[PDB]
Amino acid sequence: GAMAPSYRVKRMDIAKNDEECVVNAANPRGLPGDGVCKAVYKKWPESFKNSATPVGTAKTVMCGTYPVIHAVGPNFSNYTESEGDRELAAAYREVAKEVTRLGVNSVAIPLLSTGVYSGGKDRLTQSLNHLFTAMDSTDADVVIYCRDKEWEKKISEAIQMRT
Ligand SMILES: [Cl-]
Numbered sequence: 410g411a412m413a414p415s416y417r418v419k420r421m422d423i424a425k426n427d428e429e430c431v432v433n434a435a436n437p438r439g440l441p442g443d444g445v446c447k448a449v450y451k452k453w454p455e456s457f458k459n460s461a462t463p464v465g466t467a468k469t470v471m472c473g474t475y476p477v478i479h480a481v482g483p484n485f486s487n488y489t490e491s492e493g494d495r496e497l498a499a500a501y502r503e504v505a506k507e508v509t510r511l512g513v514n515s516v517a518i519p520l521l522s523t524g525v526y527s528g529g530k531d532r533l534t535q536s537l538n539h540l541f542t543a544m545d546s547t548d549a550d551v552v553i554y555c556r557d558k559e560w561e562k563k564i565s566e567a568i569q570m571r572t
Pocket residue numbers: 420421422425
């Protein structure tokens with residue numbers, strides 16, 4: 410575990426993380442995809458060997474000794490708000506199990522279901538709150554990656570609020 414487990418946010422490409430493992434915002438079929446998934450594919454392509462996994466699950470594949478946790482959030486275009494919310498919570502619970510199993514002291518994590526899977530809605534608070542519920546019982550240092558300047562401020566404020 411980390412000696413004083415923390416949350417931090419950085420506005421940068423998760424492919425440049427300084428953590429012991431990365432969470433991919435994966436599609437269910439293990440395809441290269443877009444956004445975070447495309448950046449992960451370019452950096453750790455070997456981790457996409459048998460990475461296909463259902464919605465609401467996470468599957469880890471090693472790129473050398475570096476763990477890539479493929480976490481599949483729901484596409485809110487296809488799910489009801491209610492069933493989507495359930496699957497988004499589930500995906501983050503499976504990430505917490507994998508982080509614990511791997512025994513890493515740190516993890517880079519994006520906000521699941523906030524880009525092309527958002528169904529055209531702002532899901533910063535919904536996704537961030539499911540991340541906290543899952544990860545609060547882990548002792549890994551958690552570094553959340555984002556690309557939008559205004560999202561960086563809101564994620565930073567939400568982390569500070571609880572401390
Ligand atoms: Cl960058």
